[PDB]
Amino acid sequence: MSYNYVVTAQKPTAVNGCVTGHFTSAEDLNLLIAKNTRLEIYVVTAEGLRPVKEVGMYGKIAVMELFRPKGESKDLLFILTAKYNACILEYKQSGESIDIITRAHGNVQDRIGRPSETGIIGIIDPECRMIGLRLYDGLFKVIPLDRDNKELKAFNIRLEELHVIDVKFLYGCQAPTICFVYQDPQGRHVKTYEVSLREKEFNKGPWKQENVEAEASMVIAVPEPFGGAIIIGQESITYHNGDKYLAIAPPIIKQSTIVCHNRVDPNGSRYLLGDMEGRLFMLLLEKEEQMDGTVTLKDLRVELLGETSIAECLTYLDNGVVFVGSRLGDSQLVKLNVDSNEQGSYVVAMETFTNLGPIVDMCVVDLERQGQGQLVTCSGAFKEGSLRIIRNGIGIHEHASIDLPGIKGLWPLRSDPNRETDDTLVLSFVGQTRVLMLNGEEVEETELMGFVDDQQTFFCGNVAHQQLIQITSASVRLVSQEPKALVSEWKEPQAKNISVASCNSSQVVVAVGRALYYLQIHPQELRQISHTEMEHEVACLDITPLGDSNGLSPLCAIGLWTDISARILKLPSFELLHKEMLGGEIIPRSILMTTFESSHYLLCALGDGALFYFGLNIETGLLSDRKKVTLGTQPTVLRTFRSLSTTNVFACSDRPTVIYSSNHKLVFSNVNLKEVNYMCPLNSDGYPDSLALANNSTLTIGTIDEIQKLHIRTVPLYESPRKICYQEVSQCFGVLSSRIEVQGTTALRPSASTQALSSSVSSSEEVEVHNLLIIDQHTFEVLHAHQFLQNEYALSLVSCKLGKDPNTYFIVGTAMVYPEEAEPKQGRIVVFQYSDGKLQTVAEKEVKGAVYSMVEFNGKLLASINSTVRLYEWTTEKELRTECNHYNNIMALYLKTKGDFILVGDLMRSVLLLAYKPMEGNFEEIARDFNPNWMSAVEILDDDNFLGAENAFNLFVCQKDSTDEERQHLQEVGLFHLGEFVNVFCHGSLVMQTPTQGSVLFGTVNGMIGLVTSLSESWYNLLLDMQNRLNKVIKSVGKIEHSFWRSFHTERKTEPATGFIDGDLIESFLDISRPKMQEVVANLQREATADDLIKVVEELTRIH
Ligand SMILES: COc1cccc2[nH]ccc12
Ligand SMILES: COc1cccc2[nH]ccc12
Secondary structure (H helix, E strand, C coil), rough: CCCEEEEEEEECCCEEEEEEEEECCCCCCCEEEEEEEEEEEEEEECCEEEEEEEEEECCEEEEEEEECCCCCCCCCCEEEEEECCEEEEEEEEEHHHHHHEEEEEEECCCCCCCECCCCEEEECCCCCCEEEEEEEEEEEEECCCCCCCCCCCCECCCCCCCEEEEEEEEECCCEEEEEEEEEEEEEEEEEEEEECCCCCCCECCCCCCCEEECCCCCCEEECCCCCCCECCCCCEEEEEEECEEEEEEEECCCCCEEEEEEECCCCEEEEEEEECCCHHHEEEEEEECCCCCCEEEEEEEEEHHHHHHCCEEECCCCCCCCECCCCCEEEEEECCCCCCCCCCCCCEEECCCCCCCCCCEEEEEEECCCCCEEEEEEEEHHHHHHEEEEECCCCCEEEEEEEEECCEEEEEECCCCCCCCEEEEHHHHHHHEEEEECCCEEEECCCCCCCCCCCCCCCCEEEEECEEEEECCCCCCEEEEECCCCCECCCCCCCCCCCEECCCCEEEEEECCEEEEEEEEEEEEEEEEEEECCCEEEEEEEEECCCCCCCCCCEEEECCCCCCCCEEECCCEEEEECCCCCCCCEEEEEEEEECCEEEEEEEEEEECCCEEEECCCCCCCCCEEEEEEEHHHHHHCCEEEECCCEEEEEEEEEEEEEEEECCCEEEEEEEECCCEEEEECCCECCCCEEEEECCCEEEEEEEEEECCEEEEEEEECEEEEEEEEEEHCCCCCEEEEEEECCCCCECCCCHHHHEEEEEEEECCCCCCEEEEEEEEEECCEEEEEECCCCCCCEEEEEECCCCCCCCCCCEEEEEEEECCCCCCCCEEEEEEEEEEEEEEEEEEEEECCCCEEEEECCEEEEEEECCCCEEECCCCCCCCCEEEECCCCCCCEEEECCCCEEEEEEECCCCEEEEEEECCCCEEEEEECCCCCCEECCCEEEEEEEEEECHHHCCCCCCCCCCCCHHHHEEEEEEEEECCCCEEEECCCCEEEEEEEEEEEECCCCCCCEEECCCCCCHHHHHHHHHHHHHHCCCHHHHHHHHHCCCECCCCCCEEEEEEEEEHHHHHHHHHHHHHHHHHHCCCCCCCHHHHHHHHHHHHHHCC
16 A cells, blocks of 8 residues: 655664674784674774774664684684574674574574563573574573584573673683672562583572672673673672672772773783763773692772763774774774873773764755755764754865866876875866976976877876876877987877777876787886787777786777677787677766785676676686676766775766775765866875866866765764754754763753753753754854753654744753653743854743644744644734643653644654644644554655654555545555664655655664665565566575565564565665576566666666
C-alpha cells in the first residue's frame, strides 16, 4: 500500500567499542573499531592507523572480542549482534583479495527472557575453553569453544544473583572461573564461580564473596603474574585474589564516574581509566616479591594524566599512543609523554576524528547559495557539545583569477633544475601555446627558449637528464635546462601531424592517426625505439608508470575509434596484452593507469560522460571487474594530482569530480564548481600545493579541501545543545542548550551560554542550567544567551510569525523539573524577540505541564503539554490564547503538521492523526495507530502517509484504511528494522535542487544520517526483486540473513519488513562481480540487462 526507500547518507560515526590484537596476521598489531553496524580494521604502525578492511554486518554489534584457540595461527573474532546473531570470524588475504570468513555461527536467543539492565555482556576465557554471555537476568549462557561446534550450540546455567553489574573470566585458574559484581538489598558484592563443562553448572569459586562499594560498576581481570580482579567504583578501587584484598579510596576519582579501562602493560602493571568528564588516569599496580616466586600486589596508585574526549573506550597502541573512542564527541589519537607540559598534562592530542553523534536535533538551511541545502545538527553532549554544518561536495579556495579564454590544456613545469617547486605554467590553445612564469603570486607571460608558441601543445614537462619536453601537433621537442636550448627534435618520417601524446620522465608514446611511436628520452637524444599500426585510429594514450617501477612503464594503455576499445599493450613490442570493448559509437576521450591505496586501476572516459574502470594487473596487463559510473554528459578529461600525501584523479567535465579510494573501492565526489575544462596540480612558491583550473573564459588557481563526500564544519559549544531552529529574518540560529553546574551553583568550565556577547536571564553533575543561544549564521559566534529559571528545562523551540503580527519570534517551551514528580506539573511558553543584539521577552504563558513540542500552524501556535495538544492564537495584545484542546494522549512528545492535519507521537501509543476543523474551531481525531509503540520521532510524508521511529530501532509507516470505527484505525503498511535510534526527521536534501519522490533526512544517536523517499509500486516491485536476488549471491559476514536483520523487531512483535527498500543493499549492487550481476538479472522483469540495473542504481545514489 505504501512504498519507501531508506538509504545511508552518513554512516554511524560514534565508537561503540574497540579492541586490539593480532587478527590480520600473527605479526600485525590491529585496532578493530565497532561503529554500530560497521567494523573497521586497522594495522597499527609508526605512521599511525593504516585502514585495511571495513565491512558491514547485518546487525548491531553488541559484543566484539579477539581470541586465539589452540590450533589457530592468529586471532579469531567473536561478534554478537543485538538480535543475538553469534559468529566466529577469521581474516583471510589472498592477493589484493581480502575476505572475512565465517568459521562458526548461530542465533543464541532464548524464548523466555527480557534483556538485562547493564545490557548484553560477552566474555571469553583466557584459555579459550568457552564463551560466556549474560543476555538475561538469572541466566548465564555458555558456548563451548571447540572447532566442531560450528553452530555455536550453547547451554544455560541458572545464576542465583539476578542483578549482575559486570562479569569477567579470571586468569590463572585451573577451571574457567567468572568474577562478578552483583546487587541485592544488602548492597553490592563481588563473587566467583567455576564453570564446569562436564556438569553444565557452576561450581564454588576459588575465593569467597566480599562486600564492595555501593557503586562498584566494573570488573577487571588482571593477567598473570598478579591474577585476581580489580573492582572500580565511584569512590574506591579494590583488588581481590583469594586470601588477598587491597582497597584504595583516592579523592582524585570522586568528581566523575570512571566508565572505561584498558590494560597498558601485558602483565597488568598499568591500566588507563577514563571518566565522564574526559579525565584520563593511570592505575599502577605495584608488585611484591615472594620466596616461592609468585608475585602479589603491594599497593595501587592512581595518577591524573590529562584530558581526552569523553571516552566510551580506550586502547593503548604501544609507543605512548592511545586511541580514544568516543560516543559523545570526536574520537582521537593521543600521545602520552613521560614528562608533563607547562600546564601539567602528560597527554598530547595527535589526531581528531569526526563524530556527529548523538544528533539530538537538526535543520536544513540554504546557508550560502539558493537550492544548496546544508544540514546543521545539534551534536554531542557535555564538554563535547557542538553544532555541525554538513554539506555535499568538495570546495575550492580560489587564490587567483585571470581572464584568458580558449585554454585547451595546462602543464606545470620546473624551469630551474635546482628548485623543487614549479615556477612555470604552460597553456595550450587552438593552434598555439603560451608560457606563464610565476614570481610569487605574480603571473606573467614570457617565452621559453626551446618551446614553440605557434603549435598546439599536447604535453610538456620535466623529463630525465635535467631536460624539458614539449610535444606539439608538429614534433617532439627536447630541451636542455641550462641553458634552455633545443637538443633533439623528433618528427614522423613524412612529418605528418602528431594526434595524441603521452609522456613520463623517460618514455614517450605519440600517435599519428593509426600509427604509434615509442621514444625514450636520453641525454640530448630522443631515441625512436619501436612503432606499430593500430587496427583503428587512436583516440587516447597513457603510459603513467605504476608501482615499484622506477618511473618506467612496461605498459601502454590505449583507446581506439570504431571498436571503442581500451587495450593494454606491452612496450616496446606493442603486443596486445588485453582488449576491452566498451560498447556504443562514442569514442574514448581519456585513459589513465593509476594507483589508489596500493591497487592498480585502468580508468577510461567516453565522450558521453561515462567512466569505465578496471583492476589492472601491471604484470600481465589483465583488466578485471569492470565497473561504470556517469560523471556528467560531456567528455571527461582525467588528470592525477596529490593532496595531503595522497594521489587522486581530477575529472573535468560539465560536472567536475574527484576520483579517489576508500576501503579499497573507488569513490566519486562532486567538486563544488561550475564546469571545468582542464586542470593541473601546481606547487609554486606563491601557490603551494594548489590546482590550476580552466574553463572557456578563465584561468583559476586555488587549493582544494579534504577529499571526502561530505564537508563538516564544527562549532564547539562546550555544553549540551538540545534543539535548533533557523530565523532567516535575523540571519541567525536559535539553539537550546544546557550546561551542568555543581551545587549558588558553580560551572565546571566556560561554555557557549557563559561566553555570549550579551546575556539575559529570566526573573522569578548536580544541576542543569538551560539557555537559548542566538548564533550568527555566518561566523557561528554566540551573539546572545538567555538563561531560564532555576530548575526550568527548555524542551521545545520554534521560529515563526503569528496572527497579524509581522515580527518573527523565537518561542520556547519549558518544564519545571522537581525530584519527586513522576512528570512535570508546570512549565512555560515564552515568546522572545531578537532585536538590537538581545532577546526581549514579549510574552509568557504558564501551563500545567511540560511543553514537549511546538509547531507553527496556519499562523497559530500548536503545542503539546503532557497528555494534551493545544492550539493557541496570537492576540492583538501580543498574548497567546487557547483556541482548542485535544486530551486523548498518554504523553504527547512529538508534533508535525501539514495543511490542517496534525501528526501526534505518543510516549507509548504510537501515532495519531488530528485535523483542525476551521469552520468549528476545534480538533477532530481522524484516526490513530492502535498498535502500541514507544515513539522517538515522527514525520508526515504526505497527506496519507505517516512515518514513525521507535525506541527499538524500527521504522514504520501508517496510512488511513480505505464503518466510522474502521476509518479511525491507522494501518501499519510499512515496517523496517533500521538498527539506529532516530531523534529527528526533517524534510530536505543536501543535493542541489525520478525513481523517487520527496526527501526526509534523519539524524541518530550514533551520528548516522539517513534519507527516506517514496517509490512507485512499479519501482518498489523491481527493487524488492533485486534485493531478493542480491541476498542469494552476497555472502554476509557471520552468515546473517538480510531478511532477518531487517525484520521489524520489538519485545511485542517480530515480522518481516514490508513496504521498505534497503537502499544500502540496492547500492551494493554496484560492487558485486559481473558473474553475480548477470546472476542477479536473469529473467528479471522486457528482460533487464546488467547495464540497465547499473543505470537504475546510479539514478538512486544521486538522491543523497
Ligand atoms: C566454537 O569454537 C570454535 C569455532 C570455530 C573455530 C574454532 N577454533 C577453536 C574453537 C573454535
Ligand atoms: C580512526 O578513524 C575513526 C575513528 C572514529 C571516528 C572516525 N571518523 C572518521 C574517521 C574515524
